Amino acid sequence: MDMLFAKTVVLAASAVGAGTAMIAGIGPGVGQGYAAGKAVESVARQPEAKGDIISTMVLGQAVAESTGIYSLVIALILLYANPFVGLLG
Amino acid sequence: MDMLFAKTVVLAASAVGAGTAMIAGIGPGVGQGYAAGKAVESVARQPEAKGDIISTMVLGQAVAESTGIYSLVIALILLYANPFVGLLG
Amino acid sequence: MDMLFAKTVVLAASAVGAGTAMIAGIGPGVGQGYAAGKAVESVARQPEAKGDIISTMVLGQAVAESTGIYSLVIALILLYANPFVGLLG
Amino acid sequence: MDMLFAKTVVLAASAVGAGTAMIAGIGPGVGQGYAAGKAVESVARQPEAKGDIISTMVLGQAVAESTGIYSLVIALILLYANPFVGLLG
Amino acid sequence: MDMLFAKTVVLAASAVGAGTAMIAGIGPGVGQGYAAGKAVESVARQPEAKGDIISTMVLGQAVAESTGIYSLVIALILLYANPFVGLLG
Amino acid sequence: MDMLFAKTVVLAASAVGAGTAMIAGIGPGVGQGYAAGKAVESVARQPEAKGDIISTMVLGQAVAESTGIYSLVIALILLYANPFVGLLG
Amino acid sequence: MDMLFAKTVVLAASAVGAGTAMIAGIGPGVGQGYAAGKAVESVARQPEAKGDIISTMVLGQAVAESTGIYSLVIALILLYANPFVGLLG
Amino acid sequence: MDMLFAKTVVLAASAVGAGTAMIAGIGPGVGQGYAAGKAVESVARQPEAKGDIISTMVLGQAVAESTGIYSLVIALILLYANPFVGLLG
Amino acid sequence: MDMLFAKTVVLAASAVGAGTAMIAGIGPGVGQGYAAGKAVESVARQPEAKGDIISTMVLGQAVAESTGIYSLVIALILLYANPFVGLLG
Amino acid sequence: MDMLFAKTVVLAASAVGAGTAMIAGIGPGVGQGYAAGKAVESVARQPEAKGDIISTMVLGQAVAESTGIYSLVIALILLYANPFVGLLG
Amino acid sequence: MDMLFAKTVVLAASAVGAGTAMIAGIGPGVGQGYAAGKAVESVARQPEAKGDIISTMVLGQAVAESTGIYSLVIALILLYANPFVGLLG
Numbered sequence: 013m014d015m016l017f018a019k020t021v022v023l024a025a026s027a028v029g030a031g032t033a034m035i036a037g038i039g040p041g042v043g044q045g046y047a048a049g050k051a052v053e054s055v056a057r058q059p060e061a062k063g064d065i066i067s068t069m070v071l072g073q074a075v076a077e078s079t080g081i082y083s084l085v086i087a088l089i090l091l092y093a094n095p096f097v098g099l100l101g
Numbered sequence: 102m103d104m105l106f107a108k109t110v111v112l113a114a115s116a117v118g119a120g121t122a123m124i125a126g127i128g129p130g131v132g133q134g135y136a137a138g139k140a141v142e143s144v145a146r147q148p149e150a151k152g153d154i155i156s157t158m159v160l161g162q163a164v165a166e167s168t169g170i171y172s173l174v175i176a177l178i179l180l181y182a183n184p185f186v187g188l189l190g
Numbered sequence: 191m192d193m194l195f196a197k198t199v200v201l202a203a204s205a206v207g208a209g210t211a212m213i214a215g216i217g218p219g220v221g222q223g224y225a226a227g228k229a230v231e232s233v234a235r236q237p238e239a240k241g242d243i244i245s246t247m248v249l250g251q252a253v254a255e256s257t258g259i260y261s262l263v264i265a266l267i268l269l270y271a272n273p274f275v276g277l278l279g
Numbered sequence: 280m281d282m283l284f285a286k287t288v289v290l291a292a293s294a295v296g297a298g299t300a301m302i303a304g305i306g307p308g309v310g311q312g313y314a315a316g317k318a319v320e321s322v323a324r325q326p327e328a329k330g331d332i333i334s335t336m337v338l339g340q341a342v343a344e345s346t347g348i349y350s351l352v353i354a355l356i357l358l359y360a361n362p363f364v365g366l367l368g
Numbered sequence: 369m370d371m372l373f374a375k376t377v378v379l380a381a382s383a384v385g386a387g388t389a390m391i392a393g394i395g396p397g398v399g400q401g402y403a404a405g406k407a408v409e410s411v412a413r414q415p416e417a418k419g420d421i422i423s424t425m426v427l428g429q430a431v432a433e434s435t436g437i438y439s440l441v442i443a444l445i446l447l448y449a450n451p452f453v454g455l456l457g
Numbered sequence: 458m459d460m461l462f463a464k465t466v467v468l469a470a471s472a473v474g475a476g477t478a479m480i481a482g483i484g485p486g487v488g489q490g491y492a493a494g495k496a497v498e499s500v501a502r503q504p505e506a507k508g509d510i511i512s513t514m515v516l517g518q519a520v521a522e523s524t525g526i527y528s529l530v531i532a533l534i535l536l537y538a539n540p541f542v543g544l545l546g
Numbered sequence: 547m548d549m550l551f552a553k554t555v556v557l558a559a560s561a562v563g564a565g566t567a568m569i570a571g572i573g574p575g576v577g578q579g580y581a582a583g584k585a586v587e588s589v590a591r592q593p594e595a596k597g598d599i600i601s602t603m604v605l606g607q608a609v610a611e612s613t614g615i616y617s618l619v620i621a622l623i624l625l626y627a628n629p630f631v632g633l634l635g
Numbered sequence: 636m637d638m639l640f641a642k643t644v645v646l647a648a649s650a651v652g653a654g655t656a657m658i659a660g661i662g663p664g665v666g667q668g669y670a671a672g673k674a675v676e677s678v679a680r681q682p683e684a685k686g687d688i689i690s691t692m693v694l695g696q697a698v699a700e701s702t703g704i705y706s707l708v709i710a711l712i713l714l715y716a717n718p719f720v721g722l723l724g
Numbered sequence: 725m726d727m728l729f730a731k732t733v734v735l736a737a738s739a740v741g742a743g744t745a746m747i748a749g750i751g752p753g754v755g756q757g758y759a760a761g762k763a764v765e766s767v768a769r770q771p772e773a774k775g776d777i778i779s780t781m782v783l784g785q786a787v788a789e790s791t792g793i794y795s796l797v798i799a800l801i802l803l804y805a806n807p808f809v810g811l812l813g
Numbered sequence: 814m815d816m817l818f819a820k821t822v823v824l825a826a827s828a829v830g831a832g833t834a835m836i837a838g839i840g841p842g843v844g845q846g847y848a849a850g851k852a853v854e855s856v857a858r859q860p861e862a863k864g865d866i867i868s869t870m871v872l873g874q875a876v877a878e879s880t881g882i883y884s885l886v887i888a889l890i891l892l893y894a895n896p897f898v899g900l901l902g
Numbered sequence: 903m904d905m906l907f908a909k910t911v912v913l914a915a916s917a918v919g920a921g922t923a924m925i926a927g928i929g930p931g932v933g934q935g936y937a938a939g940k941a942v943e944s945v946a947r948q949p950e951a952k953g954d955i956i957s958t959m960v961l962g963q964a965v966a967e968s969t970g971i972y973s974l975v976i977a978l979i980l981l982y983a984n985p986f987v988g989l990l991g
């Protein structure tokens with residue numbers, strides 16, 4: 013095998029892998045949406061607690077965001093800092 | 102392998118990868134719909150809090166939108182700013 | 191590889207990619223249905239709040255529609271404004 | 280590659296893509312069913328609001344139907360107005 | 369490529385595409401079951417509203433059935449009125 | 458290509474397609490289970506309404522069964538009345 | 547193609563198809579579990595209605611079992627009464 | 636094709652098929668967990684009905700277990716009583 | 725085909741099959757977490773029923789664990805007691 | 814086939830298999846998050862039961878963690894103690 | 903097979919495997935979002951228990967984070983400490 017062929021299938025597999033990793037984004041979208049719903053329900057019934065409601069929503073949502081970020085990082089490594097091309101040959 | 106062949110499989114893999122990434126869009130759809138439902142339930146029962154209900158719904162939904170945007174960005178990079186073609190040869 | 195072969199696998203991959211992106215449509219379907227259910231429950235309870243109920247339902251649903259639209263746009267780019275065929279050769 | 284071979288894999292890919300896009304139909308099925316359940320619960324407890332209940336159910340369901348329609352349109356384009364065969368050669 | 373080979377892979381891809389489209393049937397199954405459950409709960413508590421309960425259940429369920437039908441139609445087109453075989457050659 | 462080869466890949470694709478279509482069976486299982494749960498909860502509270510509860514459960518479940526039947530029909534067509542083998546040659 | 551090769555790929559495809567069909571088993575598992583939960587909750591509050599609770603649970607669960615059985619039947623046909631081997635040559 | 640090659644792909648497909656069938660195990664896991672949760676909630680509130688609660692939980696869970704068992708049986712047939720190897724020739 | 729080639733694809737397929745079977749682990753994770761949540765809610769309200777709450781949680785969870793174990797067993801058979809290698813030639 | 818080729822496809826299949834097994838991680842994430850939500854709701858309402866709430870949350874979550882661990886173990890066996898390479902030849 | 907070819911398919915398989923493992927991220931996103939929702943609802947109703955609410959939310963979420971981390975670790979091993987390349991030859 014020549015080097016152009018080797019890079020070609022390793023990068024092609026990286027494109028597939030990166031796209032697949034992003035499927036994780038489903039999670040934070042569902043979970044954070046739920047938290048948003050509860051915040052909406054709570055500010056209506058407790059206008060006074062708006063400060064706590066929104067800061068608590070944002071903290072909890074930030075935690076729920078993390079695996080979305082992990083997948084994004086894995087995809088950006090595969091696209092822009094690919095660790096396989098350097099191991100070839 | 103010649104350069105046309107190399108670009109061909111790297112770009113083909115990119116098309117698949119980009120479409121696969123967009124599957125993440127399921128998430129924000131579900132979550133934001135839920136938040137919308139709670140907003141509807143809350144403005145009915147408390148017309149007096151319409152301002153807070155809608156601003157809270159939009160803030161929380163915007164957070165839930167983020168992984169949908171990440172996947173969109175990954176797909177648009179693969180289609181219009183593909184980082185693999187330049188690494189070839 | 192000749193140019194006809196190159197276009198053939200890039201476009202074939204684009205057909206698969208476009209179909210795959212549309213899977214995101216599951217999300218808005220679920221979420222918006224939920225918002226619709228809450229709107230139904232609310233207009234039964236408070237017929238006078240019908241204006242706010244329906245305008246709030248539509249606003250929240252529109253937000254939940256966005257990732258469905260993103261996938262539609264990605265699929266239409268792949269079918270009718272394909273960015274790969276021009277990069278070939 | 281000859282033209283018959285090129286059309287063959289582009290169309291075969293289109294058949295797979297079209298079937299895959301239809302997976303989105305899961306969404307509206309779930310969401311609209313939920314809305315239906317809420318309408319059933321509401322007309323039982325408020326026979327008087329039947330008109331508003333059913334018109335609100337239909338409006339909200341119609342919105343939830345849209346990504347099902349998008350996938351149907353993408354599938355019908357791939358089967359009956361295929362945009363790839365004309366780009367070949 | 370000869371015509372028998374071309375028809376063979378286009379039809380094989382159509383078989384896969386048709387089966388894949390039918391995955392959408394999950395949706396109406398879930399949603400309509402939910403509507404059924406609410407109808408059961410409502411006739412028990414409101415025997416007097418049985419007429420409205422059942423007519424409303426059927427209307428709402430019919431709407432939720434549609435994407436199941438779309439997928440069935442796409443599958444039957446691929447099996448019995450295949451649009452690709454005629455484009456070959 | 459000879460005729461035995463053509464039948465072989467068309468039928469193999471049909472086996473995969475048929476199995477894939479049956480995935481829809483998830484739907485009715487979930488939805489009808491829910492309706493069953495509501496029927497159980499309702500006969501316990503209101504033993505008198507047992508007739509209406511069970512007839513309403515069966516009607517609603519039957520509707521939810523339909524996409525499971527559609528998939529079964531598509532799979533049985535592919536196995537026992539395959540429409541592709543006759544189109545070959 | 548010789549007959550041994552033809553049987554080999556048709557049966558291999560059948561093995562994959564049969565395993566894939568069994569994925570439907572997810573559905574009845576979820577739905578029937580739910581019905582079981584409601585039966586547990588109901589016999590605790592209303593020990594008297596135990597007879598109706600359990601007979602209603604079993605009836606509704608049996609209905610929810612059906613698509614599980616359909617997939618099982620499709621898989622057993624593919625394994626023990628395979629309809630493709632006889633169509634070959 | 637020689638007999639060793641034929642057995643090789645039929646068995647390889649069987650390994651994939653068996654693994655795929657086990658995906659059904661998701662279902663009973665979800666459903667039975669739900670039933671367990673309801674049993675916990677019920678014995679806390681009704682220590683007196685512990686006998687009925689646990690016997691009802693086990694009966695209902697057993698029913699929900701069945702499609703998990705079906706998939707297990709299909710996988711064990713493919714691994715230890717494979718019906719395809721004997722049909723080869 | 726030589727024996728090394730035959731073992732290679734049968735074992736490779738076994739690796740894929742074993743990984744696929746483990747997907748079932750999703751189920752017990754969801755269901756048992758639910759039971760855990762109900763146990764938490766119940767010991768808070770009813771500290772005196774702690775004994776029954778925890779023993780009931782563990783029994784019900786153990787049942788929900790079973791399909792997780794089945795998949796583990798299938799995966800360990802494929803890795804450490806593979807039944808296909810011995811059937812080859 | 815030479816030994817390098819045999820190890821190559823067996824290990825490549827192992828990488829795919831290991832990645833696939835990790836999909837089970839979805840389950841514990843969902844379930845344990847639910848248990849966490851109930852613990853939060855319970856300590857707010859019953860600060861005095863904090864000890865029991867947290868110990869019960871951890872016990873129940875640990876049980877829900879198990880299939881996540883099983884998949885991790887299968888993946889680490891495939892990566893670091895691969896049982897297939899030794900069976901080759 | 904030469905060493906460049908062996909490394910190429912083992913690494914390509916590793917890219918796919920790593921992306922697939924990240925699909926687990928869905929789980930913690932859903933579950934932690936739910937816990938966040940409950941924390942929002944609880945601080946609104948009970949501002950004085952803010953300390954316990956947030957510390958309990960973070961503890962429970964951390965537990966739910968673990969399988970997200972496991973998948974991340976498996977993906978980073980495959981990308982930056984790949985255990986297969988060293989086993990080759």
Ligand SMILES: CCCCCCCCCO
Pocket residue numbers: 021024025028110114914918
């Ligand atoms: C998932 C990896 C895709 C790589 C395909 C390479 C095909 C090259 C054929 O010569």
Ligand SMILES: CCCCCCCCCO
Pocket residue numbers: 024028110113114117199203
């Ligand atoms: C899924 C990755 C698509 C790569 C297609 C490459 C096919 C080239 C065959 O010559």
Ligand SMILES: CCCCCCCCCO
Pocket residue numbers: 113117199202203206288292
């Ligand atoms: C998965 C993307 C489609 C792959 C197209 C390859 C067809 C060309 C085979 O020579």
Ligand SMILES: CCCCCCCCCO
Pocket residue numbers: 202206288291292293295377381
């Ligand atoms: C996923 C679309 C399949 C396209 C495969 C075409 C293969 C042609 C074989 O000559």
Ligand SMILES: CCCCCCCCCO
Pocket residue numbers: 291377380381384466470
């Ligand atoms: C789903 C598409 C199947 C295509 C099978 C092509 C077989 C090529 C054999 O020459």
Ligand SMILES: CCCCCCCCCO
Pocket residue numbers: 380384466469470473555559
């Ligand atoms: C995925 C659909 C089955 C493809 C059957 C192709 C078998 C032909 C190999 O020569």
Ligand SMILES: CCCCCCCCCO
Pocket residue numbers: 469473555558559562644648
């Ligand atoms: C799902 C497709 C299984 C059929 C594989 C055919 C293998 C033949 C290789 O020559």
Ligand SMILES: CCCCCCCCCO
Pocket residue numbers: 558562644647648651733737
């Ligand atoms: C799904 C299992 C298919 C096994 C394909 C065997 C390929 C052998 C190539 O000569």
Ligand SMILES: CCCCCCCCCO
Pocket residue numbers: 647651733736737740822826
């Ligand atoms: C599903 C397991 C794939 C097995 C691939 C065998 C390919 C051997 C190449 O000579």
Ligand SMILES: CCCCCCCCCO
Pocket residue numbers: 736740821822825826829911915
């Ligand atoms: C999914 C299993 C990966 C097997 C890849 C083996 C490729 C060998 C072709 O030269």
Ligand SMILES: CCCCCCCCCO
Pocket residue numbers: 021025825829910911914915918
């Ligand atoms: C998913 C693993 C992809 C297989 C990489 C090897 C195929 C390209 C070399 O022919």
Ligand code: NA
Pocket residue numbers: 075076077078079930931934967970
């Ligand atoms: Na997180």
Ligand code: NA
Pocket residue numbers: 040041044077080164165166167168
């Ligand atoms: Na987000």
Ligand code: NA
Pocket residue numbers: 129130133166169253254255256257
């Ligand atoms: Na959106």
Ligand code: NA
Pocket residue numbers: 218219222255258342343344345346
């Ligand atoms: Na919509």
Ligand code: NA
Pocket residue numbers: 307308311344347431432433434435
């Ligand atoms: Na519809």
